[PDB]
Design a protein around this ligand. Structure first.
Ligand SMILES: O=C(O)c1cc(C(=O)O)c2c(n1)C(=O)C(=O)c1cc(C(=O)O)[nH]c1-2
Ligand SMILES: [Ca+2]
Lengths: 71, 573
């Protein structure tokens, strides 16, 4: 692995001598829980939705309110 | 923003962290010069009223200086005619749980500013550690709007400074040490309305690519690479947070910044080039669509987080005057790109002891790796240069356009590194590597250097006891000013590097100096208040040299010279 041998443009990764091609099934498998992985995105979606409410409220009344339960 | 641009050309102002859209950190003021700086004296001071690291620096606009602290990110405004009084104060209430997901001290790189317009009164912008972007009235401090950008429950915080462009304020991201997939967001300044959001990894629609993404350099890679350079859904916790600095070319209408390291630090858990982590971006301001994207460090194995500042210049490249960006990375390469096309003009080593890479091949754009300085599971790699802390970190540096010279505060820190396997749990650290750090082979931990970025030529090189972390300020008085982690402010002559002046501040400096004119007199100001990554040991009372992600051991003498503090020092003749 010297970073100069490329399967495609912008994709030059090779496994090192002795290390595997794919990690799934190997001793270095990350074994990620698919639900843990998705948490971020869902937290972002919820944040985006509460912000959307704050903007809607500023547009309706002319007065900014942060707390969504007081809207 | 063209009014912001104009205000930045006035030596009475210091309108953004970077000074101007090209991040020159260069002042035309000459009252303070190489032959009288020895008489520079302290004129007045303020306390910020907090401890922990004080990064960034103050702003000055229309006779008002603006001050900001680390957590809980309090902000004060000071009329420059009545320096003892605080004109207004804003004091956030934040969940103290935010402290527990900051990797490397609760630093904040500071405020931004937009003048009055259709939106309309002048605003100060604050990114808070707890993930909010706040807009305050510049003259009164009143809270105008406040939105949620980052969720601390996911290890997601804000440390990097906002960035005002046209009618938009930009907000980066942080928490790649906690497996946060990085994203940059533009909010409308009137409204706080989300306009766009570009992610650092995953699908092309999430990356926000122009249809001509990398047109001029298709060998850098183009479409689908944010998925195909990872195995399965590993990109979802993939890093590339952007907590550093931006630049802007209003003629091209392009915003420039770098995406951070891939997650985890353990390289064996994320086979692939891990695009588009570690990437110098050129995005269109209105839409956020990338026109170019250069990956400096494919498949990162060193936490060379690619967030460092972008310094724009216009210089001759093969006899032709070309618009450039220059960029000294954590990986110890100083990159210069054509800032229109993204073509690579050079990538030289900031110090010849850099060893993870032999050289960058400039035709291919690829760093040719030395396998003897790789990291990988079941191995404790010794002697790697740079360390994760980089040969260059968060400091905004400076450019003298007469000399065609960049002046930089350089780290000289090397390391050992061994990964280990660990689960991802949202909210928890997700590093998976154990480090030990120590000086590079030159023996000391810092340098200050002057270089021509196009040719790679070093004009001068001087040593410093500690890594120079906070960035520099150059001036047409032939002087470069900076702060040291041991708590000095210093001035060297920009032609030779000859030390002309120093002063003993209370605490170490991890921010930059600024200068401005107020009622006909030049001043220089700077924050004193050590902390950040070099300071983690003294800040949190750590003894184990692998703690603080490896910094503790490299920096264990720092506590013999400085304590924590929090002040603003203003100097004049
Ligand atoms: O991935 C991240 O999210 C993240 C965040 C921060 C931060 O929030 O300041 C730093 C880093 N990474 C980092 O790699 C780093 O070297 C660093 C140095 C500092 C500092 O100010 O001293 N912060 C951060
Ligand atoms: Ca990082």
């Amino acid at each position: 692995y010297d970073g100069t041998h490329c399967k495609a443009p912008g994709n030059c990764w090779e496994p090192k001598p002795g290390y595997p091609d794919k990690v799934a099934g190997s001793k270095y498998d990350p074994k990620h829980d698919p639900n843990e992985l998705n948490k971020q995105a869902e937290s972002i979606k919820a944040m985006e939705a509460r912000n959307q409410k704050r903007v809607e409220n500023y547009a309706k009344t002319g007065k900014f309110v942060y707390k969504v339960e007081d809207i | 923003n063209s009014e912001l641009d104009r205000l930045s050309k006035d030596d009475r102002n210091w309108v953004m962290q970077t000074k101007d859209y090209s991040a020159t950190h260069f002042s035309r003021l000459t009252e303070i010069n190489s032959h009288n700086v020895k008489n520079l004296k302290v004129a007045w001071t303020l306390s910020t009223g907090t401890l922990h690291g004080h990064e960034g620096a103050p702003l000055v606009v229309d006779g008002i200086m603006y001050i900001h602290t680390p957590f809980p990110n309090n902000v004060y405004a000071v009329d420059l005619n009545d320096t003892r009084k605080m004109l207004w104060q804003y004091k956030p209430k934040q969940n103290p749980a935010a402290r527990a997901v900051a990797c490397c001290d609760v630093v904040n790189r500071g405020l931004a500013y937009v003048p009055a317009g259709e939106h309309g009164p002048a605003k100060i912008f604050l990114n808070q550690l707890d993930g909010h972007i706040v807009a305050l009235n510049a003259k009164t401090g009143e809270e105008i709007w406040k939105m949620e950008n980052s969720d601390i429950a996911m290890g997601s915080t804000l440390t990097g400074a906002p960035f005002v462009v046209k009618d938009k304020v930009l907000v980066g991201s942080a928490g790649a040490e906690l497996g946060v997939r990085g994203y940059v967001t533009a909010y409308n300044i009137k409204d706080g309305k989300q306009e766009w959001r570009a992610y650092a990894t995953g699908p092309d629609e999430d990356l926000l690519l122009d249809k001509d993404f990398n047109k001029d350099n298709p060998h850098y890679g183009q479409f689908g690479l944010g998925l195909s350079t990872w195995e399965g859904d590993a990109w979802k916790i993939g890093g590339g947070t952007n907590w550093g600095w931006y630049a802007y070319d209003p003629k091209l209408d392009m915003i420039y910044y770098g995406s951070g390291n891939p997650a985890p630090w353990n390289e064996t858990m994320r086979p692939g080039d891990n695009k588009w982590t570690m990437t110098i971006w050129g995005r269109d301001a209105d839409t956020g669509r990338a026109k170019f994207g250069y990956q400096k460090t494919p498949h990162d194995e060193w936490d060379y987080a690619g967030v460092n500042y972008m310094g724009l210049s216009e210089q001759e490249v093969d006899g032709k005057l070309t618009p450039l960006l220059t960029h000294p990375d954590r990986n110890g390469l100083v990159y210069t790109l054509n800032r229109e096309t993204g073509a690579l003009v050079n990538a030289f080593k900031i110090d010849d002891t850099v060893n993870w890479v032999k050289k960058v091949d400039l035709k291919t754009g690829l760093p040719i790796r030395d396998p003897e300085y790789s990291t990988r599971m079941d191995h404790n790699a010794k002697g790697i240069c740079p360390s994760a802390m980089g040969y260059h970190n968060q400091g905004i540096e400076s450019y003298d356009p007469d000399k065609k010279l960049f002046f930089m505060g350089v780290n000289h820190i090397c390391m050992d590194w061994e990964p280990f396997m660990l689960p991802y749990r949202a909210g928890q650290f997700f590093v998976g590597a154990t480090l030990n750090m120590y000086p590079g082979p030159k023996g000391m931990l810092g340098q200050v250097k002057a270089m021509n970025a196009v040719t790679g030529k070093m004009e001068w090189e001087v040593p410093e006891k500690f890594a120079v972390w906070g960035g520099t300020l150059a001036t047409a008085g032939d002087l470069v000013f900076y702060g040291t982690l041991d708590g000095f402010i210093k001035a060297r002559d920009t032609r030779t590097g000859e030390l002309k002046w120093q002063f003993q501040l209370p605490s170490g400096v991890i921010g930059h100096p600024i200068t401005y004119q107020h009622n006909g007199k030049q001043y220089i100001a700077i924050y004193s208040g050590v902390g950040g990554w070099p300071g983690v040991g003294l800040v949190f009372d750590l003894k184990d040299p692998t703690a603080g992600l490896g910094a503790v051991g490299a920096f264990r003498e720092l506590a013999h010279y400085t304590q924590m503090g929090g002040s603003v020092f203003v100097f004049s003749l």
